[PDB]
Design a protein around this motif. Structure first.
Motif, PDB file in Angstrom:
ATOM      1  N   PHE A 122       0.825  -1.207   0.000  1.00  0.00           N
ATOM      2  CA  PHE A 122       0.000   0.000   0.000  1.00  0.00           C
ATOM      3  C   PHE A 122       0.860   1.258   0.000  1.00  0.00           C
ATOM      4  N   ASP A 130       5.521  -5.507  10.698  1.00  0.00           N
ATOM      5  CA  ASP A 130       5.495  -6.951  10.919  1.00  0.00           C
ATOM      6  C   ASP A 130       5.534  -7.313  12.403  1.00  0.00           C
ATOM      7  N   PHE A 131       4.370  -7.625  12.970  1.00  0.00           N
ATOM      8  CA  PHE A 131       4.293  -8.010  14.378  1.00  0.00           C
ATOM      9  C   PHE A 131       4.013  -9.506  14.506  1.00  0.00           C
ATOM     10  N   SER A 132       4.443 -10.271  13.508  1.00  0.00           N
ATOM     11  CA  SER A 132       4.224 -11.713  13.509  1.00  0.00           C
ATOM     12  C   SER A 132       5.005 -12.458  14.585  1.00  0.00           C
ATOM     13  N   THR A 140      -1.027 -10.724  16.485  1.00  0.00           N
ATOM     14  CA  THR A 140       0.046 -10.507  15.533  1.00  0.00           C
ATOM     15  C   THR A 140      -0.582  -9.483  14.590  1.00  0.00           C
ATOM     16  N   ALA A 141       0.216  -8.888  13.714  1.00  0.00           N
ATOM     17  CA  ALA A 141      -0.313  -7.906  12.780  1.00  0.00           C
ATOM     18  C   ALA A 141       0.666  -7.705  11.634  1.00  0.00           C
ATOM     19  N   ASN A 142       0.192  -7.069  10.567  1.00  0.00           N
ATOM     20  CA  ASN A 142       1.035  -6.740   9.423  1.00  0.00           C
ATOM     21  C   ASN A 142       0.500  -5.470   8.778  1.00  0.00           C
ATOM     22  N   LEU A 144      -1.698  -4.793   6.754  1.00  0.00           N
ATOM     23  CA  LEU A 144      -3.146  -4.687   6.606  1.00  0.00           C
ATOM     24  C   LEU A 144      -3.811  -4.044   7.822  1.00  0.00           C
ATOM     25  N   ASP A 145      -3.097  -4.010   8.944  1.00  0.00           N
ATOM     26  CA  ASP A 145      -3.649  -3.460  10.180  1.00  0.00           C
ATOM     27  C   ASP A 145      -3.308  -2.002  10.436  1.00  0.00           C
ATOM     28  N   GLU A 150      -6.303  -0.828   2.128  1.00  0.00           N
ATOM     29  CA  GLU A 150      -7.344  -0.883   1.105  1.00  0.00           C
ATOM     30  C   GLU A 150      -8.637  -0.146   1.451  1.00  0.00           C
ATOM     31  N   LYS A 169     -10.546  -2.468  10.841  1.00  0.00           N
ATOM     32  CA  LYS A 169     -10.312  -3.868  10.483  1.00  0.00           C
ATOM     33  C   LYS A 169     -10.827  -4.773  11.607  1.00  0.00           C
ATOM     34  N   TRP A 171      -9.994  -7.688  12.492  1.00  0.00           N
ATOM     35  CA  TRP A 171      -8.920  -8.370  13.206  1.00  0.00           C
ATOM     36  C   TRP A 171      -8.459  -7.526  14.389  1.00  0.00           C
TER      37      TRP A 171
END
Ligand SMILES: C[C@H]1O[C@H](O[C@H]2[C@H](O)[C@@H](O)[C@@H](O[C@H]3[C@H](O)[C@@H](O)[C@@H](O)O[C@@H]3CO)O[C@@H]2CO)[C@H](O)[C@@H](O)[C@@H]1N[C@H]1C=C(CO)[C@@H](O)[C@H](O)[C@H]1O
Ligand SMILES: C[C@H]1O[C@H](O[C@H]2[C@H](O)[C@@H](O)[C@@H](O[C@H]3[C@H](O)[C@@H](O)[C@@H](O)O[C@@H]3CO)O[C@@H]2CO)[C@H](O)[C@@H](O)[C@@H]1N[C@H]1C=C(CO)[C@@H](O)[C@H](O)[C@H]1O
Ligand SMILES: [Ca+2]
Ligand SMILES: [Mg+2]
Ligand SMILES: [Mg+2]
Ligand SMILES: [Mg+2]
Ligand SMILES: [Zn+2]
Length: 435
Positions: A122, A130-132, A140-142, A144-145, A150, A169, A171
């Motif tokens: 984006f 990256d919070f994986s 966790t997050a990436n 998209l959060d 989008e 979101k 999530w």
């Protein structure tokens, strides 16, 4: 609590400041103060963000990394947070509860920090989203959060360069409050009673509203602005209280510059949250981000005898001011400071007002003096007409009682304002025999 409860407008203690001693000793330190704060009449304590932050042992908690690590997982170079271990935090919360003192969680959800680098389609570049790898394995997050994504490029606001959370979101909603596995659920499960939402200007009021619809509890939002309309708008849209920054800046203008009229005019014109809706205003003299009021005695005398719900700053109570004066004001707040307010008198250096009383508190008369001399003047206070009034602070140098004539006139006095020499600049009065 000893006197009034948090939900009854009781006094709150902000139990930290910026850059408190590290080494994971803060939770235990605050715990050691609980018995003392109980005896002082404190109804609740506001603790700093409890989660493991990006800066690990150096974190003040406002750069949250792993929300579900309250100091028990090894990551960011430490197991404990700057404040202590999870076990120590739970012990602190439960100890506060043993004394009937409620606990407020500092919720930081506008942004996140410490994430690893990852390609963000984006943005068209790498972002720290990256919070994986959070050790708790929760939330966790990436990319998209966060914003942009989008759904939209941004929300109400950002904080520095920290990844901005997209609460729209599902999530993120689920992990923060919208489930029994959420951060809110976790905080509540260990004992947190209420909430202090950080930087609410950065996201929608609807977020706090839904959080409260799910968990309830006392809540306040940190909306940094001087525009009362904006603060109250957020307060009603969110369902939470707001810190009275307008009052804060007016008290600075008034008490630090021998200009009490500035405060009185702000109050009368509804230019403070408290003079508009005292049930929404959380008043304070100082906090961990700003401390510009040098003449704190009249400021505390004001917020502890006027309307609203007052917060005492840790440093003022435990380190910088005459603790006995604050303990006295807390007693006065919970036993005498009730009802509507009637301004009796004011000029550059004097402020006299009456609290007309409620169902549990008979009311009072506050006399603030900013001058370095003893002051006295006749005041018309018909509420106390023909009654015996007592001075409840002891600031006049001893036990003082006065008889208000049948008309309501009485000669009121206040000590000089010269704290460097042991004179605090205020007197508080009410019916004799209250306690
Ligand atoms: C407990 C309450 O004390 C203080 O509230 C006082 C107001 O500041 C005064 O303006 C006056 O309000 C009166 C209304 O104007 C009148 O229309 C009628 O509703 O009676 C009211 C008085 O009984 O007197 C109030 C009470 O002394 C303080 O400012 C306020 O923050 C306190 N509110 C706490 C109590 C509850 C629930 O019972 C919660 O909504 C609030 O969060 C608490 O802070
Ligand atoms: C598992 C995944 O759940 C969440 O991701 C969801 C997004 O939040 C939704 O917005 C939606 O994204 C789709 C867009 O709407 C669509 O326009 C298009 O861009 O495709 C997107 C999906 O690729 O649906 C997503 C779920 O499919 C949550 O936000 C996200 O953090 C979660 N990702 C986890 C998975 C991995 C994989 O190793 C890690 O990178 C992350 O740390 C995990 O949290
Ligand atoms: Ca934001
Ligand atoms: Mg420790
Ligand atoms: Mg100042
Ligand atoms: Mg004067
Ligand atoms: Zn968003």
């Amino acid at each position: 609590a000893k006197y009034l409860e948090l939900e009854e407008g009781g006094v709150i203690m902000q139990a930290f400041y910026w850059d408190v001693p590290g080494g994971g000793i803060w939770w235990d330190h605050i715990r050691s103060k609980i018995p003392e704060w109980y005896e002082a009449g404190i109804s609740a304590i506001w603790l700093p963000p409890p989660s493991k932050g990006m800066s690990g042992g150096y974190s003040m908690g406002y750069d949250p990394y792993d929300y579900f690590d309250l100091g028990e997982y090894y990551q960011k170079g430490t197991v404990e947070t700057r404040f202590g271990s999870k076990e120590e935090l739970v012990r602190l919360i439960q100890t506060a509860h043993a004394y009937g003192i409620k606990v407020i969680a500092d919720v930081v959800i506008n942004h996140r920090a410490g994430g690893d680098l990852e390609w963000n389609p984006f943005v068209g570049d790498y972002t720290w989203t990256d919070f994986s790898k959070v050790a708790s394995g929760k939330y966790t997050a990436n990319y998209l959060d966060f914003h942009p994504n989008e759904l939209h490029c941004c929300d109400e606001g950002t904080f520095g360069g920290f990844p901005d959370i997209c609460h729209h979101k599902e999530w993120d909603q689920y992990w923060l409050w919208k489930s029994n596995e959420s951060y809110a659920a976790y905080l509540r499960s260990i004992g947190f009673d209420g909430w202090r939402f950080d930087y609410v200007k950065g996201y929608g009021a609807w977020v706090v509203r839904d959080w409260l619809n799910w968990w309830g509890g006392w809540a306040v939002g940190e909306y940094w602005d001087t525009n009362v309309d904006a603060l109250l708008s957020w307060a009603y849209e969110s369902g939470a209280k707001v810190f009275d920054f307008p009052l804060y800046y007016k008290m600075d203008e008034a008490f630090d510059n021998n200009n009490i009229p500035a405060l009185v005019y702000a109050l009368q014109n509804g230019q403070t949250v408290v003079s508009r809706d005292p049930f929404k205003a959380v008043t304070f003299v100082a906090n961990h981000d700003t401390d510009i009021i040098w003449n704190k005695y009249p400021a505390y005398a004001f917020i502890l005898t006027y309307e609203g719900q007052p917060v005492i700053f840790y440093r003022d109570f435990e380190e910088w001011l005459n603790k006995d004066k604050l303990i006295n004001l807390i007693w006065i707040h919970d036993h005498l400071a009730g009802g509507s307010t009637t301004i009796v008198y004011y000029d550059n250096d004097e402020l006299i007002f009456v609290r007309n009383g409620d169902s549990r508190r008979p009311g009072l008369i506050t006399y603030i003096n900013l001058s370095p001399n003893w002051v006295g003047r006749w005041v018309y206070v018909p509420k106390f007409a023909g009654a015996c009034i007592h001075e409840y602070t002891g600031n006049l140098g001893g036990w003082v009682d006065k008889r208000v004539d049948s008309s309501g006139w009485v000669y009121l006095e206040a000590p000089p304002h010269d704290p460097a020499n042991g004179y605090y600049g205020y007197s508080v009065w009410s019916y004799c025999g209250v306690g």
